[PDB]
Design a protein around this ligand. Structure first.
Ligand SMILES: *[C@@H]1O[C@H](CO)[C@@H](O)[C@H](O)[C@H]1NC(C)=O
Ligand SMILES: *[C@@H]1O[C@H](CO)[C@@H](O)[C@H](O)[C@H]1NC(C)=O
Ligand SMILES: *[C@@H]1O[C@H](CO)[C@@H](O)[C@H](O)[C@H]1NC(C)=O
Ligand SMILES: *[C@@H]1O[C@H](CO)[C@@H](O)[C@H](O)[C@H]1NC(C)=O
Ligand SMILES: *[C@@H]1O[C@H](CO)[C@@H](O)[C@H](O)[C@H]1NC(C)=O
Ligand SMILES: *[C@@H]1O[C@H](CO)[C@@H](O)[C@H](O)[C@H]1NC(C)=O
Ligand SMILES: *[C@@H]1O[C@H](CO)[C@@H](O)[C@H](O)[C@H]1NC(C)=O
Ligand SMILES: *[C@@H]1O[C@H](CO)[C@@H](O)[C@H](O)[C@H]1NC(C)=O
Ligand SMILES: *[C@@H]1O[C@H](CO)[C@@H](O)[C@H](O)[C@H]1NC(C)=O
Ligand SMILES: *[C@@H]1O[C@H](CO)[C@@H](O)[C@H](O)[C@H]1NC(C)=O
Ligand SMILES: *[C@@H]1O[C@H](CO)[C@@H](O)[C@H](O)[C@H]1NC(C)=O
Ligand SMILES: *[C@@H]1O[C@H](CO)[C@@H](O)[C@H](O)[C@H]1NC(C)=O
Lengths: 135, 135, 135
């Protein structure tokens, strides 16, 4: 990337800013901007790019071959009992939460077994997480 | 990318901004912008790009071959009992939640077994997560 | 990257900023900006790039072959009993949470078994985590 910005509230290239209880009297503003942005970005010049994959087997014997790629999800148990009894009680559960593995962002890129590539790979993430607000 | 912006509330290239209880009297504004943006971005020049995949087998013997790619989802148990009894109670569940793996964003890109590629791969994510607001 | 910015509240290339209880009287502003930005960024010049993968087997004997890539998820147990009884009680659970492995951002890039590549790989993350706010 070139210019990544995280902004709290306000972005202003020029900000003539006024707020509460202000006497804005007798002001003279003269402003000139000559803004130039010039970009020559990610330019590629290749005369020759060769990509070659070759597998050769000559009368061989193969047995018990197992190939498993990344992210091998197997045989998991989740158990969350919630056994609640009462005897003459006043229950006040205002903001109570039960969350099993809640996901927000899952960006999977280049997850394979055999891979050959040429070039550029780029991932950008912005957010404002707030999980819980209870008053 | 070139220009990624996360903005809190306001973006303004020029902001003549006024708010509450303001006496905006006798103001003279003169403003000139000469804004130039020039882009030559991701330009490719290739004379020769070769992509070649070859598999050759000569009278070989193959047995018990298993190939499994990424993301192998198998044999999972989720158990969330919720056993609730009462005896003479006042229940007040105002903002109570039970969530099993709630997903927001799942961006899968290039998830295979065998892969060959040339070029550019790009992912951009913005959001404003707030899960729960209870008053 | 070139310019990564984390901003608290406000970003302003020029900020003529006024707030509460201000007497802005008799002000004369003269402002000139000649702003030039020149970028020649990630430019590649390759005459020859060769990528070659070759596997050759000559009448060999293969058995009990197991290949497993990264992220091998197997055989996990989670058990979170919640056994609650009462006898004549006043329950006040205002902001109480139970979270098992809640995920926000999972960026997976280049997770394979065999990999060959040429180029640029880039990941950018901004956020404002706040998990819980209870008043
Ligand atoms: C604002 O400017 C004018 C002209 O220059 C002047 O007559 C006036 O008195 C000024 N205002 C104040 C409050 O001085
Ligand atoms: C910008 O405008 C002001 C206004 O008078 C002038 O004096 C200045 O020469 C200008 N500059 C350019 C680069 O145009
Ligand atoms: C790519 O094009 C030609 C071929 O090599 C080269 O002369 C030129 O300078 C390159 N372009 C850039 C922007 O570098
Ligand atoms: C491995 O080979 C033996 C006998 O050759 C067979 O019993 C077994 O099932 C094989 N393994 C798998 C995972 O199939
Ligand atoms: C605003 O400007 C005019 C002309 O310059 C002037 O007559 C007037 O008095 C000014 N206002 C104030 C409040 O001074
Ligand atoms: C912009 O406008 C102002 C207004 O008077 C002028 O003085 C200045 O020369 C101008 N600049 C350009 C670059 O046009
Ligand atoms: C691509 O086109 C020709 C062929 O190589 C080259 O001369 C030129 O400079 C390249 N273009 C750019 C924008 O670099
Ligand atoms: C592996 O081979 C054995 C005997 O050759 C067979 O019993 C078994 O089922 C094979 N494995 C699989 C996964 O089929
Ligand atoms: C503001 O400027 C004008 C002209 O220069 C002047 O007459 C006036 O008295 C000034 N204001 C104050 C409060 O002095
Ligand atoms: C910018 O504007 C001011 C306004 O008078 C002028 O004096 C100065 O020469 C200008 N500079 C350029 C580079 O345009
Ligand atoms: C790439 O293009 C030609 C070929 O080598 C070279 O002369 C030129 O200087 C390069 N471009 C840049 C921007 O370096
Ligand atoms: C390894 O080989 C033995 C006998 O050759 C077989 O019993 C066993 O199942 C093999 N292992 C696997 C994981 O298949």
């Amino acid at each position: 990337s070139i210019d990544v910005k995280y902004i709290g509230v306000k972005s202003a290239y020029v900000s003539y800013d006024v707020q509460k209880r202000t006497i804005y009297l007798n002001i003279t503003n003269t402003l000139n901007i000559t803004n130039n942005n010039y970009y020559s970005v990610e330019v590629e010049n290749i005369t020759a790019q060769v990509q070659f994959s070759k597998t050769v087997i000559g009368k061989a014997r193969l047995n018990n071959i197992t190939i498993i790629g990344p992210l091998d999800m197997k045989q998991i148990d989740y158990t969350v009992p919630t056994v609640i009894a009462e005897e003459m009680s006043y229950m006040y559960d205002f903001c109570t939460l039960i969350s099993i593995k809640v996901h927000n962002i899952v960006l999977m890129m280049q997850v394979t077994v055999t891979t050959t590539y040429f070039g550029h790979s780029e991932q950008i993430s912005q957010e404002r997480y707030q999980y819980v607000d209870c008053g």
